[PDB]
Design a protein around this ligand. Structure first.
Ligand SMILES: Cc1ncc(COP(=O)(O)O)c(C=O)c1O
Ligand SMILES: *Cc1c(COP(=O)(O)O)cnc(C)c1O
Ligand SMILES: [Cl-]
Ligand SMILES: [Cl-]
Ligand SMILES: [Cl-]
Ligand SMILES: [K+]
Ligand SMILES: [K+]
Ligand SMILES: [K+]
Ligand SMILES: [K+]
Ligand code: NA
Ligand code: NA
Lengths: 320, 319
């Protein structure tokens, strides 16, 4: 649907949420079998998710009371756990039920839902593999988080190609495993600050684009969509962009994307669960094309938000 | 001598193991309170967890003496500056608290960890001025060994990793000591899979870097070699350089090709959590004659001697 329809609905739902006297309207967490306010939630100091960031995670959205692509996200964090040699510690059916219960209890209709699986209390260094499967899980539901605020999506945002940092390469850490080892991405955020921009686009140092601080990067040139095929998370928002492109008969190329190409793009946008489809209209301080949000970006934008109401991709939470 | 130094540790350990003090198992300092490390808790929303947005350092106490504490605290300050963190206590205060914790525990041989995190406000969408309410956690445990003492007589088994390479400096500055161990942890598993213990990571560009919590040192034709870049500037490594200089042994901090590991006369690792740790098997083959070598032994001896030298150590008052 259109930006104005999507956002006006969000604003109405928010304003209602903000008037709520339910303390869980600010979020809810599940830690050691108990529901607690996120500010009160605590984890063991000795959890290896803290002591060596030895964890994977995933993030799902709820929009207008509808979970979006929950099955796809759960499959992804099962794959991440397998790649990490972590045993996912709950039945999938159990996690699905608990997450829906959390969202319902909060009353939050537009939510950010985070699932974290850590190595647990026994570190890898000095352990037998069979002693490394008592793994911990933490669940968190918050009001929907925007990597680009609604008001900013109308006009687009300001990016830089980073020059003080490059993406951690796959031979150091497999970027298809969604992880919280953000040392490169965090530095990119600071570089953007220092350079008067907001969004860092990290290279691989070998002249190609990868991803940013919590989003994939998409270029549009001569009617074709391009996005990096390696060095990045296989985003489910990106997956959804591919679906919308198919529905619209727009060619999309998953391939190596040289940095040079960003400087001649007709359109650029970022994509992620925490915000959706986020246009970029300034790059390294200069306009991207004419400086306007472009027509293919808008088609993708509208189709992406329509998927949030499509029963093939979403289901409603029962708030009771 | 591996006899004198270890035998003392074993006696001190045996005494500690019979202690009735609850803190003989360790002690932590969290939000101004002393608690057992198993009971210690951190906020879920701390960015040290939520984005591993932190630095840390580790200091030892050996035989009741802090080793090179001031060097470690200087390093932590440098790591905080590089990370844009504001170290949240006076150095005098942290020194006093750490000594108080060690004394309260009764532990004579200790692993002491200091962690500084970004705190509760994440970097994205934040003004820099709002990112300086940074958190600190302190932890004292019984001394941890990356190579157990009895194993140091024999040496350990290393591999040059082939499924992982070290995070490059352009992705994260390895001179900032950090807990983003994704490469190092995978190296530990690779070593497991290959029937070894210690992973030596490359840079992918044919040179050695460091391993999973230690620096790498080669010895060839009487000269010591260790990587200059891509690694933490270890304080154990610093101490190796001091001992080499005291013994008139040539030590070169330079790029060290992987190839050279396959021809070394001796190899050892170095770290606070274990000291000087010989490697006598590499990729399943003996290093030289498969014996702990003479230069390694001289470095080991000198390293432990420094723990009693007032220039490098001071005694904790256990009251
Ligand atoms: C990656 C790495 N290498 C080496 C070391 C050893 O440094 P130190 O001698 O200061 O314990 C540490 C700590 C570390 O994190
Ligand atoms: C989560 C994330 C993305 C986007 O993933 P989605 O599956 O679209 O939410 C992109 N890059 C990085 C580094 C991420 O952590
Ligand atoms: Cl998930
Ligand atoms: Cl620190
Ligand atoms: Cl320190
Ligand atoms: K997982
Ligand atoms: K698994
Ligand atoms: K620090
Ligand atoms: K600082
Ligand atoms: Na991520
Ligand atoms: Na480290």
């Amino acid at each position: 649907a259109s930006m104005d329809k999507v956002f006006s609905g969000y604003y109405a739902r928010q304003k209602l949420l903000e008037r709520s006297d339910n303390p869980f309207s600010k979020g809810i967490a599940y830690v050691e079998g108990k529901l607690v306010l996120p500010s009160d939630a605590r984890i063991p100091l000795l959890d290896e998710g803290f002591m060596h960031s030895d964890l994977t995670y995933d993030v799902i959205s709820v929009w207008d009371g509808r979970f979006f692509r929950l099955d796809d996200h759960l499959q992804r964090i099962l794959e991440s756990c397998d790649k990490m040699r972590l045993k996912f510690p709950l039945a999938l059916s159990s996690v699905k039920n608990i997450l829906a219960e959390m969202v319902a209890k909060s009353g939050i209709r537009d939510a950010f839902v985070e699932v974290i699986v850590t190595r647990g209390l026994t570190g890898v260094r000095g352990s037998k593999p069979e002693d490394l499967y008592n793994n911990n899980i933490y669940l968190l539901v918050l009001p929907y988080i925007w990597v680009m605020a609604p008001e900013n999506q109308l006009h687009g945002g300001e990016a830089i190609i980073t020059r003080t940092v490059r993406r951690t390469p796959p031979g150091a850490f497999d970027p298809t495993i969604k992880n919280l080892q953000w040392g490169d991405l965090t530095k990119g955020l600071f570089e953007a600050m220092d350079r008067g921009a907001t969004y860092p686009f990290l290279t691989d140092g070998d002249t190609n684009l990868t991803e940013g601080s919590g989003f994939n990067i998409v270029l549009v040139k001569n009617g074709i969509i391009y996005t990096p095929d390696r060095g990045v998370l296989r985003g489910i928002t990106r997956k959804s962009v591919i679906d919308v492109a198919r529905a619209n008969s727009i060619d999309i190329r998953l391939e190596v994307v040289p940095v040079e190409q960003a400087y001649h793009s007709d359109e650029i946008f970022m994509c992620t669960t925490a915000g959706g489809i986020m246009p970029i209209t300034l790059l390294d301080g200069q306009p991207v094309n004419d400086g306007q949000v472009g027509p293919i970006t808008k088609k993708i934008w509208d189709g992406y938000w329509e998927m949030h109401y499509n029963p093939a991709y979403s289901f409603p939470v029962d708030y009771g």
